[PDB]
Design a protein around this nucleic acid. Structure first.
Lengths: 95, 103
DNA sequence: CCATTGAGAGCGGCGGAGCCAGCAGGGAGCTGGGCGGTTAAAACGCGGGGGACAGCGCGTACGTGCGTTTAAGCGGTGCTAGAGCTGTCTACGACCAATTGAGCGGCCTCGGCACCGGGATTCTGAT
DNA sequence: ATCAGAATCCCGGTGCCGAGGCCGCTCAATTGGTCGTAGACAGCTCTAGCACCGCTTAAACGCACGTACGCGCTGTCCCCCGCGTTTTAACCGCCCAGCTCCCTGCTGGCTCCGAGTGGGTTCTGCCGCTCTCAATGG
C-alpha cells in the first residue's frame, strides 16, 4: 500500500508553534500541502533561471534568497530573508 | 538531523533531495535546502497564524479551508502572493457594492 | 617375586499402461451498487414594480489654433569605471556504502462539531 | 418613527464519524569518506557609459474661444422580481451484480505385468582402538 509523502506532520508542528490549542481538517491539510509544493516550485524555479542567467551551475542559499525577493511582496519577503539568513547561520554554527 | 541544527521544524533533508531530483541545476549547495525549508516554514506559519485567528473569530477549534481563504484574502500581502490560486471550499469574502444596497 | 608390554581378540565405529489425489483456473449464491418509488429543487404560472432605455436639454470641459517658451535631439570631445575576459588553487559538491530512526499506513477511541427544535433578536414593509 | 411580523441568529441538547494519536516497520536520511571541478578571486584591458557644451528647432506650454459631449431629468414600457403550483431530479427502499462459492480439468503417484521345472555360480562388513594374557626383561 504505497508510501505517499507530504508535509502534513510539519505543518502540524508549526501549527502548535503558533496556535498550541488549535487543530486542522484533512481538507485544509491538503490546501496547506498544496500551498507548500506550489511555493517550493516557484522559488526553486526562479532560482533555477537565476543560475542559468548567470552562467553558473549551482543553486546556493544566495540564489534561493534573491528568488525569494523576486517572488515575495515587500514585507513577506523581508521576514522571509530574515528566517532564511537566520536558520542558515544557525545551521553553519552546529556540525 | 539538520532541522534541529538550524532550529527548523521543516524537513531540511526532504528539501535537499527535492532540489537535486527536480532538475533545477547540476549541483546544489548546502545552505539552500536550509534557507528554503526556512522560508517555507516561515510562510506556512503566517498562514497558520491568521487562519487560526480566523477560526477563533469564527468560533471553532479546527481550521477548515474557509479559515484559510479568509486569512488569505484579508491579508493584503498574502492575497497578492496567491493572486492566481483558487482555494477549494474557500467561498468569497462578503462584499456588496454600495449602489446595490437599499436606500 | 616383580612388571612394562607385544600379541590376542573383541567391540565401537563407517518399462508401460491405467486409476484416484491435488491443484488451478472460470462462472453466478449473498452483501454492495444500480434501478424503482418518494420527495425537493427546478420549470413554470401569475402579475406588478422599478429599472432599462430613449428623448431632451443645460452647462461646461476639452479640442483646436496661435503665439510664446522651453529643452529635446544632434554629434563632437573628453574621462575612467566597470564589465568581460583571463589565469591559478582549492573548497565544496557529487557520488558510494553501511547504519540508523524519521515518517508513513494502519489502527482505534473519542470529542469538535454537524444537526436541530425552541426562544431570542433584528430587521422589513405596512401603516 | 411605530407597529407587528418575518426570517435569522444563538442556544442547549444529542450523536456520530474523522481527527489526532500510537503501534511498529522500513527506506529515506545521515554518516564517513574520496575526487575533481565550478567558481572564487586577484590581475588586466578595453568597451560604452556618463558628462558636458552649443547650434538648431521641433516640441511643449499657456491662453482664447465655442462646440458638442458629459450628465441630470424625465417619462414610459416590460423585463425580473417575489409568491406560489406542478414537473422533474435527488434521496430512500427494493432488485440485480461483484465479491464470492462451486465445478471441471490436468498431472503426479502407485500398482501390475502366465504357469510350472532343472541345473549352475556367486555372495554371510572391514578397521582399528582399548582390555586382557602370560611371555619374558631386571
Amino acid at each position: 500500500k504505497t508510501r505517499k509523502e507530504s508535509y502534513a506532520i510539519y505543518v502540524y508542528k508549526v501549527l502548535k508553534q503558533v496556535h498550541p490549542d488549535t487543530g486542522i481538517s484533512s481538507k485544509a491539510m491538503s490546501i496547506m500541502n498544496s500551498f507548500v509544493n506550489d511555493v517550493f516550485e516557484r522559488i526553486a524555479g526562479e532560482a533555477s533561471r537565476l543560475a542559468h542567467y548567470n552562467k553558473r551551475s549551482t543553486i546556493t542559499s544566495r540564489e534561493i534568497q534573491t528568488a525569494v525577493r523576486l517572488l515575495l511582496p515587500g514585507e513577506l519577503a523581508k521576514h522571509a530573508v530574515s528566517e532564511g539568513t537566520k536558520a542558515v547561520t544557525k545551521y553553519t554554527s552546529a556540525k | 538531523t539538520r532541522s534541529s541544527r538550524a532550529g527548523l521544524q521543516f524537513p531540511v533533508g526532504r528539501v535537499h533531495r527535492l532540489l537535486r531530483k527536480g532538475n533545477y541545476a547540476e549541483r546544489v549547495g548546502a545552505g539552500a535546502p536550509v534557507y528554503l525549508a526556512a522560508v517555507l516554514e516561515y510562510l506556512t506559519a503566517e498562514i497558520l497564524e491568521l487562519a487560526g485567528n480566523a477560526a477563533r473569530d469564527n468560533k471553532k477549534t479546527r481550521i477548515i479551508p474557509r479559515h484559510l481563504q479568509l486569512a488569505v484574502r484579508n491579508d493584503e500581502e498574502l492575497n497578492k502572493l496567491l493572486g492566481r490560486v483558487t482555494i477549494a471550499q474557500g467561498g468569497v469574502l462578503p462584499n456588496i457594492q454600495s449602489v446595490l444596497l437599499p436606500k
